[PDB]
Amino acid sequence: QQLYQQMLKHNNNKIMQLRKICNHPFVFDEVEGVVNPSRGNSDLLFRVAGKFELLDRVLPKFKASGHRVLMFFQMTQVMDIMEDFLRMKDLKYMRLDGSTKTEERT
Amino acid sequence: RKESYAIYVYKVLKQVHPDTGISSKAMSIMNSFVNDVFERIAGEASRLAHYNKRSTITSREIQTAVRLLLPGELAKHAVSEGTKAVTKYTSA
C-alpha cells in the first residue's frame, strides 16, 4: 500500500514499478534489504505481498485436494520468489523459462 | 577619453574592505579581469543563441553561460546573485 502510494507519487516505472511491487515488493532488492536485512526465507516474504497470502489460501488446500497447477509470470524475482514460497511451504515444483536450455526443457 | 571599470571595482572594494586601498597596478589587473569575464560569458551566450537558432540574448542565455563558465560554488552563487538582481530590477 505504501510502496504503491509512495511510488504512485514518486513517479515507465509508473506502470512497471507499480507492477513490480504489486507482484511482490522484494523484486526491488533494496526494499528487501530494508524490510528484512537478513534476506532469509522469513514469513515476511508472505506478509509483504497479498498475492502470495492468496497462494497460502490456495496452494495448500490445492495440493491437499490432489490437483496440479500451471502459472505464468514476468521474469526475474517475480518467479524466483515463487521458488522460495514453494520451498517454504514444501510445495514441490519445477521452473521453466527463456534462460533454460532445450535439454532440460524436454 | 577611455573608459574602464576602475571606479566600479573601487566602489566594490569599499563595500568589502572599507579601509583597504588598491594600487594602480592591481587596479589595471582587475580591469582586465572584468573584461575577460565579460567576454567569456558574452561569448558563450552568443553561441547559445546560435545553437538554438535564436537571435536574442536574455538572462536565460547568460544564466546558462554562467553555468557553463564558472566552476562549482562560483556558479551557484553567481546565478543566485543574477537572479536577485533581475528580480529586484523588474519588481521595482
Partner: protein, 107 residues
Amino acid sequence: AKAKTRSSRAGLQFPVGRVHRLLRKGNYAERVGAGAPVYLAAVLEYLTAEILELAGNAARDNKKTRIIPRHLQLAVRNDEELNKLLGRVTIAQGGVLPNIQSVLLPK
C-alpha cells in the same frame, strides 16, 4: 521626468547601461534582452567582489593596507575555484606561491 539609472534600479555597483551597450557593440547577437545586461552586471560584480575580498585578506596577512598584484595572485591561486576559473591566466607581477617539494627538503 525623474531619472534613475538601471544600475541603481537593480541595486548593482556595475554600470548596467554600459554593459548593455557593450553587448550590442560586441555583436554577440542581433537583439539584447532588457534583463540581459542586468543579470550580467550582477555576475560581474559578484566575481569582482569575491576576488577583492580574498585580495584584501591577503593584504591583511602581509600587514598591508593596499592591494597589490601579489595579493591578487595569492588570492586567486589559493582559492580552488578561482584558480580553476583563471587557470590559464598570467597575472602581471603576481609571482608564484611559496612551495618547496618535500623531496628537496632535508630529512
